[PDB]
Amino acid sequence: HWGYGKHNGPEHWHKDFPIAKGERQSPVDIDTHTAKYDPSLKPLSVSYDQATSLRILNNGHAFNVEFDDSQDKAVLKGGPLDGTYRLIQFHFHWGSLDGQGSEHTVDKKKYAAELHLVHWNTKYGDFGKAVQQPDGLAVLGIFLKVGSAKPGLQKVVDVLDSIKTKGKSADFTNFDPRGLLPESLDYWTYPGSLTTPPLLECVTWIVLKEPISVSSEQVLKFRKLNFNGEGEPEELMVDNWRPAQPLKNRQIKASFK
Numbered sequence: 062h063w064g065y066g067k068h069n070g071p072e073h074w075h076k077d078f079p080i081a082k083g084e085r086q087s088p089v090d091i092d093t094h095t096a097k098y099d100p101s102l103k104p105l106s107v108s109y110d111q112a113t114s115l116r117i118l119n120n121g122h123a124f125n126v127e128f129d130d131s132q133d134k135a136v137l138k139g140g141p142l143d144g145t146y147r148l149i150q151f152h153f154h155w156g157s158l159d160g161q162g163s164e165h166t167v168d169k170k171k172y173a174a175e176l177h178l179v180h181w182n183t184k185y186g187d188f189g190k191a192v193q194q195p196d197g198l199a200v201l202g203i204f205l206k207v208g209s210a211k212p213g214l215q216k217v218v219d220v221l222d223s224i225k226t227k228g229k230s231a232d233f234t235n236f237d238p239r240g241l242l243p244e245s246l247d248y249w250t251y252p253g254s255l256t257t258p259p260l261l262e263c264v265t266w267i268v269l270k271e272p273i274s275v276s277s278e279q280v281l282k283f284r285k286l287n288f289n290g291e292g293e294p295e296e297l298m299v300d301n302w303r304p305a306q307p308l309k310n311r312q313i314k315a316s317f318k
C-alpha cells in the first residue's frame with residue numbers, strides 16, 4: 062500500500078489518491094514575510110487538563126497515541142476555529158538525520174520532527190463524518206528541534222521498545238499531552254489537508270511558531286522503530302514526512318504581530 066519509500070512514497074500517492082494534486086494540500090512552506098497578522102483571530106484555547114489517553118499503536122507509518130474522544134475531555138477552541146474540536150490522537154513525523162523530518166517548513170527551514178495533535182469538530186458527531194467536511198478537523202502542529210530533552214516526551218520514548226513493529230500496541234493511559242507544548246501559543250494558520258493518504262481536504266492547520274526542544278537521544282529512539290511487521294526484514298521508521306506542497310490560492314495568517 063502507500064508508504065514513504067521510493068516505490069510507494071509521496072510521488073506515487075496521486076495514483077490512488079488524486080486529491081494529492083488538489084487545491085488545499087498539506088504541508089506547505091510557511092513564508093514568514095508573506096504571512097499576515099490577522100486581528101480577527103480570536104484567542105486560541107488548548108484545554109487538555111481532562112485528557113484521557115488510552116493506547117499507543119505502531120500503524121506502520123508512525124505511532125499514534127490515542128485518546129478517549131467519547132466526551133469533550135481534551136479540546137481545542139478559538140483561534141481561527143468556530144466551535145469545539147476534540148483530541149483523538151497525536152503522532153509525529155521525523156527524519157533519518159536531524160536536518161530533516163518536519164512536514165511544514167518555515168522559510169524553507171526543515172525541523173528534526175513535527176508533532177500533530179489531531180482534533181475533530183464535534184458538530185459532526187464522529188471523526189468519520191468529520192472527514193467528509195471542509196471544516197471537519199483541526200491539527201495543532203508543533204516543531205521539534207534537537208537540543209535539551211523534553212521531559213514530557215520521555216514516557217513516549219520509553220514505551221517505543223514495546224511497539225517496535227507494525228501492528229503492535231501498548232497501554233498508554235494517564236499521559237498528559239500538556240507536557241508536549243512550548244511556552245508560547247503564537248501560531249500560523251491556513252486551510253489544508255491530511256498529510257497522509259487519503260489526503261482529505263478537511264483540516265484547519267494551526268502551526269505553533271515556537272518549537273519544542275527534544276534531545277538527540279529522544280529522537281534517536283524514534284528512529285529505532287520499524288515500518289515492517291514482526292518477522293519481516295527490518296525497515297527503520299525514518300523519513301515519514303511528506304514534503305511541502307503548492308500553496309495555490311491560500312493565505313497563511315499569523316496570530317502575532
Ligand SMILES: NS(=O)(=O)/N=C1/NCCO1
Nearest residue numbers: 177179200254255256257
Ligand atoms: N499527518 S496528519 O495530517 O495528521 N494525518 C492524519 N491522518 C489521520 C489523522 O491524521
Ligand SMILES: [Zn+2]
Nearest residue numbers: 153154177256
Ligand atoms: Zn501527521
